[PDB]
Ligand binder design. Structure first.
Ligand SMILES: O=C(NCc1cccnc1)Nc1ccccc1Cl
Length: 278
């Protein structure tokens, strides 16, 4: 519950802020798991953060959310054990595919991927859990095209350009952030909805471009001010070439100026699983 000696470390999968993820083998033939441990330079602050993440993760029980399989909080060394997701994060996965003409992925499959994210988010909503960093870099692919939402410390490292860093401030995914988050730092379910729109845009781009990729960080922050001013000078992500107009309009609703006018995840799921099929 759970004995450490049964873990055979295989390869480093990546490195976060207080943690590090390795592929491991379990001997009771061989089961593969992903194991998050403290980094070698871990401090007391890191240990505390690790213990809090166990607490948060122990609550989360849904098919489309990362699952905690097992733990060491018992005796050190600390670890979290989760499912090994053979196909990596969603960003890597989609980047390695092209859209089917007429390794490939179909448009109905992109919808299925996005519907699974929406369902994960619907679960989190019911718990009044705000994610704060929804993006494809934070989703895992298991196949048979199983998507699980996670929150990786390591995302901040391998996707450094996706985060706006000022000394003494929190590290902010500004390109995925609702205008009111950029201007006020008020993170809500409604700002998760906005980030879901951006995430959906990424899925439809097959992760080929950063959101507002031709614009600087400052222009992105200035753009949020334009939402606030509401003088019809705000700018939006363009329609992906794979995206039909009806699906684009769903994205646009995620990006409503008013929080309350953004669709709940129940509705987003329904649209992506049913309405989008026509
Ligand atoms: O995904 C999360 N942690 C990365 C991890 C953990 C264990 C093994 N491998 C990776 N956490 C997480 C997920 C959803 C909401 C909040 C958090 Cl903090």
């Amino acid at each position: 519950d759970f004995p450490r000696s049964r873990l055979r470390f295989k390869e480093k999968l990546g490195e976060g802020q207080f943690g590090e993820v390795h592929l491991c083998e379990v001997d009771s033939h061989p089961l593969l798991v992903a194991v998050k441990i403290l980094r070698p330079d871990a401090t007391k602050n890191a240990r505390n953060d690790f213990l809090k993440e166990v607490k948060i993760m122990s609550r989360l029980k849904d098919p489309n959310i990362i699952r905690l399989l097992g733990v060491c909080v018992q005796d050190d060394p600390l670890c979290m054990i989760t499912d090994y997701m053979e196909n990596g994060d969603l960003n890597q996965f989609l980047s390695a595919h092209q859209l089917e003409d007429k390794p490939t992925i179909s448009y109905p499959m992109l919808l299925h991927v996005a519907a699974q994210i929406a369902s994960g988010m619907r679960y989190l909503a019911t718990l009044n859990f705000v994610h704060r960093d929804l993006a494809t870099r934070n989703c895992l692919v298991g196949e048979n095209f199983t998507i699980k939402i996670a929150d990786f410390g390591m995302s901040r490292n391998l996707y450094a350009g996706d985060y706006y860093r000022v000394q003494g401030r929190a590290v902010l995914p500004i390109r995925w952030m609702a205008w009111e988050c950029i201007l006020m730092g008020k993170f809500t379910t409604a700002s998760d909805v906005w980030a879901f729109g951006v995430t959906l845009w990424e899925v439809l781009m097959l992760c080929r471009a950063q959101p507002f990729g031709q614009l600087t960080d400052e222009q992105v922050i200035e753009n949020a001010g334009e939402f606030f001013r509401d003088q019809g000078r705000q700018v939006y992500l363009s329609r992906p070439p794979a995206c039909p107009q009806g699906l684009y309009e769903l994205m646009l609703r995620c990006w409503s100026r008013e929080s309350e006018q953004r669709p709940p995840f129940s509705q987003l799921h329904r649209f992506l699983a049913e309405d989008a099929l026509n």
